[PDB]
Amino acid sequence: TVPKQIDIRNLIKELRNVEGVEEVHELHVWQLAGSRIIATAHIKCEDPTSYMEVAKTIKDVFHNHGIHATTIQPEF
Amino acid sequence: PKQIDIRNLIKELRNVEGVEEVHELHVWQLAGSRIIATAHIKCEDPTSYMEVAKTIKDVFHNHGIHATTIQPEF
Secondary structure, rough: OOOOOOOEEEHHHHHHOOOOOEEEEEEEEEEEEOOOEEEEEEEEOOOOHHHOOOOHHHHHHHHOOOEEEEEEEEEE | OOOOHHHHHHHHHHHHOOOEEEEEEEEEOOOOOOOEEEEEEEEEOOHHHHHHHHHHHHHHHHHHOOEEEEEEEO
16 A cells, blocks of 8 residues: 655665665666565676676665566676 | 466576576466566576576567566676
């Protein structure tokens, strides 16, 4: 009975501020029953050493904005 | 306008060069008759992946799925 609010602006800004993230090329969100929100992102990263290190940070940022299921596609 | 042949899709993905493992192969039906897919993929190394990501995208396209997000494990 209670819609969940997604802060687009701070989500995208926090993602862009993750070390080694050069661009967010794609980001979609969609929502299911039980206010469960799913997201995809395509990101440009500096190099594959960054990405493996920083994927956890991205997942944490999503989680901090009430999105618990993500698929992150990097471009190097 | 194409069926998604599930068995061939999984089998083709698994046989893409440098793909070691395919997990979490999800197909989502969204509004406006949109189908997208997500997948977790274990690759040999990041040189393979950047080579293969086009191939995976095209395999998905071939099985009637036009938007994909592939999450690699190195």
